[PDB]
C-alpha cells in the first residue's frame, strides 16, 4: 500500500487543495507522457519546505520507467540525494 501511504502523507503535508493539484498533474502525465510538466507541479508543491523534499523523491513510484533516470537527476539537482 505504497500508493495510499503516499497520498496520506501528501494530503497531510500539502493540504487538500495541494494534494488535489498533485493528483491532477499525475492524471495529466498518464494522458500526455510529459515528465517536465508533472515535475514542475510536484516541485512547486514539495520544495517550499525542506521537510517536504521526501515527497518529491517518493513520487518516483508514479514515474514511467523511461523517465525514471531523468526524474531522479532533476530531483537530486533540486534537493540532493534522498
Numbering used by the authors: 14 to 95
What does the study report here?
The regulator of telomere elongation helicase 1 (RTEL1) is an Fe-S cluster and DEAH motif-containing DNA helicase with ATP-dependent 5′ to 3′ helicase activity. RTEL1 plays essential roles in telomere maintenance, DNA repair, meiotic recombination, and genome-wide replication. It is a modular protein consisting of an N-terminal helicase domain followed by two tandem harmonin homology domains 1&2 (HHD1 and HHD2), a PCNA-interacting protein-box (PIP-box) motif, and a C-terminal C4C4 type RING domain. RTEL1 is an anti-recombinase and executes non-crossovers by promoting the synthesis-dependent strand annealing (SDSA) pathway of homologous recombination through disassembling displacement-loop (D-loop) intermediates during the DNA repair and meiotic recombination processes.
To understand the structural basis of RPA 32C and RTEL1 HHD2 interaction, we determined the structure of HHD2 at a resolution of 1.6 Å using X-ray crystallography (details in the Materials and Methods section). The structure revealed that HHD2 consists of five helices, from H1 to H5, connected by a short loop. All the helices are mainly α-helical (3.613 helix) except the N- and C-termini of H4 and the N-terminal of H5, which consists of short 310 helices. The overall topology of RTEL1 HHD2 is similar to the N-terminal domain of the human Harmonin. Using NMR spectroscopy and isothermal titration calorimetry (ITC), we showed that HHD2 also interacts with DNA using the RPA 32C binding surface. This study establishes HHD2 as a novel accessory domain of RTEL1 that mediates both protein–protein and protein–DNA interactions. The X-ray crystal structure of the HHD2 domain of RTEL1 reported here is the first structure of any domains of RTEL1.
